[PDB]
Design an enzyme around this catalytic site. Sequence first.
Site, short mmCIF file in Angstrom:
data_model
loop_
_atom_site.label_atom_id
_atom_site.label_comp_id
_atom_site.label_asym_id
_atom_site.label_seq_id
_atom_site.Cartn_x
_atom_site.Cartn_y
_atom_site.Cartn_z
N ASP A 35 0.84 -1.20 0.00
CA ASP A 35 0.00 0.00 0.00
C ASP A 35 0.87 1.25 0.00
OD1 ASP A 35 -2.00 1.90 0.33
OD2 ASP A 35 -2.26 1.49 2.46
N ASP A 220 -1.71 5.59 -4.95
CA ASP A 220 -2.12 4.76 -3.82
C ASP A 220 -2.48 3.35 -4.29
OD1 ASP A 220 -3.23 3.67 -1.55
OD2 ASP A 220 -4.59 5.33 -1.18
#
Length: 377
Positions: A35, A220
């Site tokens: 992430d 992201d």
Amino acid sequence: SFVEMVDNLRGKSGQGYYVEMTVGSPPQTLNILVDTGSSNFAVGAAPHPFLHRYYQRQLSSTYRDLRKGVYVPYTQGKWEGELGTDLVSIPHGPNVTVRANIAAITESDKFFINGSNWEGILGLAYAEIARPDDSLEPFFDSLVKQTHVPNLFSLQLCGASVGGSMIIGGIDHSLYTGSLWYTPIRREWYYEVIIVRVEINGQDLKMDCKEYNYDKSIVDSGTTNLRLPKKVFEAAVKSIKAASSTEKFPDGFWLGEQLVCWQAGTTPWNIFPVISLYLMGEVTNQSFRITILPQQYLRPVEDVATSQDDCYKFAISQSSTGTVMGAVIMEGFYVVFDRARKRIGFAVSACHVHDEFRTAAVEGPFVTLDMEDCGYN
Ligand SMILES: CC(C)c1cccc(CNCC(O)(O)[C@@H]2C[C@H](C)CCCCCCCCC(=O)N(C)[C@@H](C)C(=O)N2)c1
């Protein structure tokens, strides 16, 4: 030695990409979601209905308690746990072992996904957004400080069950075609960038470019969709609706709720437009663009019905916390997080998305005046 890291990511559509890691002594194997939109390293450390396995601190001779609590609320999902340190390695990664901060997840809400096959999260962004505060050194900072691994990594996320690569410490030139185009990292907290222009099927949305970055734009890998601020989202949906008015869809489709389906092999790709995001370049008044195909923002989903047709979910969501370049945008591009030079690189991936008459692209240079004014303050 980068070839050892090619194809080291796996995942299920809409459930993120994960890498295999080990924690503690003797090594405990865990799949960790990668992430770039957060900065905490966390693992399940207590039983959970959706957890196949979890970190057992009691069995690690190298575990150390930090006697501090921690909690992380994401845009969707959250967990709380106990901080500590332990030794960590990446089997299909660099050949090193680092002592890293680990949040042992003890309680969570709508975070783990039923049958997702990962048990933790590796936040690759900067300390500034680490919880509980920026003094908790993120994993990658620890790796760079403790080893000779260069301060950059790259992500090749391949689309439609899915796989890809996380090249730790460098760039693997066999993973992309064409040239790499770089955009400055505006500030080292999220991987924040500046979008300077948006086009749908070659038509400029014609908005104050500050709207594109209100209140920030980030890259992201932990977010599925392309997420756009309210104003931008409404313009883009209005434009995508008009281009595809040949057919009709439930209005809950445009909200990401309902899925749409077509007879296997007859998805009318041609009526969905391509989206172009222009990013601030490396030289004055220069930008470059990435072009997104409808095969990226129409995410394929399994049909829970007796039919074996082609079904999709609209993977563009409204956001109230800025633009998010999520996984469906990163799929088909090779994305270089060049932390050492405060920049992010884009190139067409070797596992690129295929259309019949159209292709995803990274093209430059472009001239763009007053790019400075596109950043939000
Ligand atoms: C932690 C701090 C710094 C913070 C706070 C707010 C926002 C951000 C920006 N990044 C958000 C994120 O990408 O880290 C998470 C990760 C996730 C919970 C990690 C587990 C889920 C992985 C697969 C499902 C993806 C579905 C999806 O797309 N989601 C669940 C978005 C909505 C989201 O919320 N994803 C960071």
